[PDB]
Amino acid sequence: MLKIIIPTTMLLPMTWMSKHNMIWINATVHSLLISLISLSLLNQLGENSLNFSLTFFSDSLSAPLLVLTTWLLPLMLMASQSHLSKETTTRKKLYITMLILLQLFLIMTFTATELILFYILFEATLVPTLIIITRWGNQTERLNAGLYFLFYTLAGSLPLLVALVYIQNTTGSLNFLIIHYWSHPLSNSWSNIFMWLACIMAFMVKMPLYGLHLWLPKAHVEAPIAGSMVLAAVLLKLGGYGMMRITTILNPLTNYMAYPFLMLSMWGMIMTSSICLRQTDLKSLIAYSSVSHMALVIVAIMIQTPWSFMGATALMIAHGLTSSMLFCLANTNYERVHSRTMILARGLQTLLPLMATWWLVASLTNLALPPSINLIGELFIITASFSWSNITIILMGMNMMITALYSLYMLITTQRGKYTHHINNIKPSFTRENALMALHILPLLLLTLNPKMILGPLY
């Protein structure tokens, strides 16, 4: 696993010793090379895992997340090149350093074989994100946003640490392989109930679960574009990966401890979706759509069936790519208009046709049009939920309809109709933006050809 970790670390001296005008070029080229190297992790077995050493191991659940993490960095660099033009060289290097440190922490977190190691890196991912949000954010709300993003997270994760050390004093190990092979049932007890809550709440708060999601709209609308990309595409999936890993020691308590969350998700996905129908901010709408998709992922993980896990993995990957693309499109509008209000810039299909095509493809993917992998994950989750209880279809069905509505709403308000008369500064789209959208959208349609790569270890 060090063949990926060491070059990512070498990105830092390469960034700092680079010329003043060559930081973006070198960073982009070497990040793309690291992504190409990390592509080799996709060769997985139907057997246990790729146990490289005592410290790191890879799975068909970890491999797609690692590939997505390594692929997101060049896109973030391209997206950040524009609005950081008038910034001093040292601060640009600091920005790139924050992005590299985030990538390193994520890489290690996904492959860590120890629960405590996983916790440490899972928390280490907070500092770069907080600095990025509160330093290079634009509005004055960013400070408050950062505070929320911090304390919510910590409020969930401090109990987990306690539980973790408690577990290691009882079983004697926190290694995931030993934990899986030596699993024992959890008896119905108040102590076991609180241990379950401590092990679950930290991952619930970062999905985010409905009712614990208030930090996400603030953080995503106040972050810079690269921060929004990494928050929506990768940092949300940390909770899903953690819950997928930790549910092996929580049975059979999950059979009845999952009821409050399942409801909170199944109703919650409705509410957030309906919230998207009445929203005046593009980024806020995209963030709430992320909340709805992650509620579906929460349901999938709590159901605890093979089809549920396959659908959850596929949906996590698909949502990461789609939400990153949508945030990039919204930002490409914002850098022209400087408003972030949906109804200001209108009728943009007439002025920017290719960007309108990108908007259409992104909206179609978010709408879960078959055979996209978004729909593959959604349909597998829906089938598993139907087996769990035939009534669930109702709520699931409703969500589907609502989703389409707001997706097309966002497409119709910004792209169709008449152009705004007084807005005369809408320049032709640059090659950088078009390439960014193409590099977002081509991997999705390529992945629909080999879905087994993103279906997780239960395929």
């Binding site: 410290t55 120890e114 405590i116 290691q168 926190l174």
Partner: protein, 57 residues
């Protein structure tokens, strides 16, 4: 025919020849508790190192 002892003579530490047996436990002490086992041997490296959380050394 008595001769007065001189200076420094009555403060001498003398010796006494007695048939009284020497007491063996004048303090009436009980049996002293046995000491701790006092383990000893050759030092070997710790098995798998510190074994602290995720550290392999």
């Amino acid at each position: 025919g008595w001769v007065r002892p001189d200076l420094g003579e009555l403060s001498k530490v003398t010796k006494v020849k007695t048939d009284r047996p020497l007491p063996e436990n004048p303090y009436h002490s009980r049996a002293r508790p046995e000491p701790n086992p006092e383990a000893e041997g050759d030092l070997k490296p710790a098995k798998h190192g510190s074994r602290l959380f995720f550290w392999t050394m």
